[PDB]
Design a protein around this ligand. Structure first.
Ligand code: DMA
Ligand code: DMA
Ligand SMILES: [Ca+2]
Ligand SMILES: [Ca+2]
Ligand SMILES: [Ca+2]
Ligand SMILES: [Ca+2]
Ligand SMILES: [Ca+2]
Ligand SMILES: [Ca+2]
Lengths: 314, 314
């Protein structure tokens, strides 16, 4: 990406190239018929936020951007891609679709095999950390799939994001810093910062989905997914809260009902409630950066979080 | 199981209990809603052939049946269960079935997370070995899914079994022996023996599916899966080979066509061709046991293979 420091920008950009090379090698490893399938399902790329965060984190150690830092970053990104493959097959909830599903399940699995190969060269602490991280991630997908049962819907939603999204970003910071040989306190801070940042990104995304116009809103609503601002509004002891409770159980479908709900939400206190929750995570993020030495990298991380927050408020 | 040595029988049976305990702990670890799902999909158990083979293999090391041997065995069995979960979802090729599929995909994934936790305590060599093994296994499932393309159907079939089945049994022998501290030659022999045995079990199973009566035959045929004896028969320059080629492309369905094919196969040389291939693997198996010290455990392994072979010939 682009930071204040142009010296930083260049170092990082060079490392991102090394990450992309090793990643491509792994995605294209194996028997022809299998590689063909993986390459056809290749997502067409991404922002690579997770490996970049791992690279930034490594700047706090004695060996920034070293070969094992690049390898850890690739492990994190491979894991990310594997989960997308498995998540996509489940978003699907005749025989040319049952084939498509087998294929993506196996693509996700071969990716995990590749990731494990690299982790074997990174050490058992990485494997242990990965096992916990991937377990959490899978727990988040299961949690989302089963729903809130009879728990508080806001706690459920928070848990789903912490697990499905937060932990892997926390892991990028952890592994980036650890394989750079950073101090334990700094490793821990970057891990915690990643977790807080994961919460910020998702809640901000959810706010935008409901309250913004153009770069149509209400995507989550149509699918029947009620995110933080909606959950807060449904809680209110007001006429708007009451009307939202009475509508948001029945048939979700026609555009007119969706647009009425969207207006109700704009009349509710849900946006600001979600935004205050974003601010609380930003306070957490800032407290973690507090544990790190002042530097342009620290400020680049702070800005990553702050810029996201500013998409929805100040 | 039951071997000649009753002293062996007791040692092994005690270790299998320890394997079952740790396995159950892992399958039942995690959040309530996730454990509930895993336990509901628990296969209802199995023969545990793979962990038993790992335990037998460890008898050739300085530390037979030690705690890490038990842990390796559980890793192999967890991996086995994970692949079944993913394989089952693909054998499936409306919304209460799309839910069932997400669930099994995630169950297989949480199992891999559990396996990785244990491997982190077993060392990087185990993780490396696992990465290769699981990669092969996934390659076999993909290979079966895509079909033989334009390769020799017999080579394809052999590759599918070596990868889908053989490698994990080879891995049980490898890991059992290695974590017992066996000598490299012995570790290697037990690994190779496991691979040969995997081929024997599957080909014998396929022969039985076609040529036996009661403990109905032709399961694979109905599903359109042509195993070794069928592939050999389809190769023959005889009237029976010609008639099989002309039938085994068209509509596979009615019982009368199935039963006619079954009779044709009994008139062909396919059974004996498959059986000679079994004998060739048995020769390989015996050559591997040759590398191991004489002992009741060696003979128990030999008998495991020999007893299987005798289900279909002498
Ligand atoms: C593993 C993982 C988080 C996949 C995508 O999750 P998501 O459902 O938040 O993404 P999308 O909404 O695009 O399906
Ligand atoms: C991972 C794995 C080998 C699952 C079962 O394979 P299979 O298709 O041979 O078993 P089944 O024939 O019972 O589906
Ligand atoms: Ca999804
Ligand atoms: Ca969104
Ligand atoms: Ca309004
Ligand atoms: Ca199957
Ligand atoms: Ca069978
Ligand atoms: Ca006959």
């Amino acid at each position: 990406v682009e930071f204040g420091d142009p010296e930083l920008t260049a170092r990082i950009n060079d490392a991102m190239v090394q990450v992309e090379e090793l990643l491509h090698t792994e995605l294209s490893s194996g028997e022809d018929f299998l590689v063909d399938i993986v390459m056809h399902l290749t997502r067409a790329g991404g922002k690579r936020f997770r490996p970049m965060f791992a690279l930034l984190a490594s700047e706090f150690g004695e060996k920034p951007l070293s070969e094992n830092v690049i390898k850890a970053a690739v492990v994190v990104e491979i894991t990310h891609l594997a989960t997308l493959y498995h998540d996509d097959v489940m978003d699907e909830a005749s025989a040319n679709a049952r084939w498509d599903n087998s294929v993506a399940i196996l693509a996700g699995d071969i990716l995990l095999a590749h990731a494990s190969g690299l982790m074997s060269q990174l050490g058992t602490d990485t494997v242990a950390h990965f096992a916990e991280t991937f377990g959490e991630l899978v727990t988040g997908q299961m949690r989302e799939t089963v729903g809130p049962r009879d728990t508080d819907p806001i706690e459920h939603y928070t848990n789903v994001i912490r697990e499905k999204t937060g932990v892997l970003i926390a892991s990028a910071g952890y592994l980036g810093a650890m394989h750079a040989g950073a101090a334990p306190e700094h490793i821990d801070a970057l891990k915690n910062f990643g977790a807080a940042v994961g919460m910020i990104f998702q809640i901000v995304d959810d706010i935008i989905d409901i309250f913004s116009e153009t770069h149509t809103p209400g995507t989550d609503l149509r699918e029947g997914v009620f995110t933080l601002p909606v959950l807060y509004a449904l809680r209110e002891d007001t006429p708007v809260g009451a009307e939202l409770r009475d509508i948001l159980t029945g048939p979700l479908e026609d555009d007119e009902t969706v647009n009425h709900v969207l207006e109700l939400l704009s009349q509710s206190g849900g946006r600001q409630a979600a935004l205050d929750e974003v601010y609380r995570y930003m306070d957490i993020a800032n407290a973690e950066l507090d544990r790190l030495p002042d530097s342009t990298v620290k400020e680049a991380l702070r800005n990553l979080a702050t810029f996201t927050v500013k998409r929805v408020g100040e």
